From a paper:
We tested the interaction model proposed above by mutating Arg85 of IL-4 and the super-agonistic variants to alanine and measuring the residual binding affinity to IL-4Rα. Changing Arg85 of IL-4 to alanine does not change the binding affinity for IL-4Rα dramatically (KD (R85A)/KD (wt IL-4) ~ 4.7-fold, thus ΔΔG = 1 kcal mol-1). This is in line with the observation that residues in Cluster III do not generally contribute to the overall binding. In particular, the dissociation rate constant is only increased by a factor less than 1.3, showing that the hydrogen-bonding network of Arg85 with IL-4Rα provides no free binding energy. To exclude the possibility that structural changes in addition to the removal of the Arg85 side chain play a role in the changes in binding stability, we determined the structures of the IL-4 variants R85A, T13D-R85A and F82D-R85A. No changes in the local structure around residues Thr/Asp13, Phe/Asp82 or Arg85 could be observed (data not shown).
Numbering used by the authors: 1 to 129
Amino acid sequence: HKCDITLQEIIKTLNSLTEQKTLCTELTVTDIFAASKNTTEKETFCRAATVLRQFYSHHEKDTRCLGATAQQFHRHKQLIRFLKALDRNLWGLAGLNSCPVKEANQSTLENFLERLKTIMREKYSKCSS
């Protein structure tokens, strides 16, 4: 369970998300990693899944994000697609739907994905010889 390939599914999704600039990757999410490290692994995934869900719900039809061009509209749809896939995988990992996230700090979505990526790669590394 712990070292399941969902880890890889999440990482590969993170690679696509961070190699991807849009109009709205600088918009913010609550920085659940501004905590002082106080929670289990399932709480962490649940919290990450929560704030990402917050983001895609709120920015899927956001006029600031939707795009003028074909390419901008394509990239926005891509992003929302990848957040949902990531989110799906995080929730599957979390095994938990209810978890209060209490942080004041916001980071850009972009910074938050890089941080989640680091942690995910660390989990994988810890699993692997």
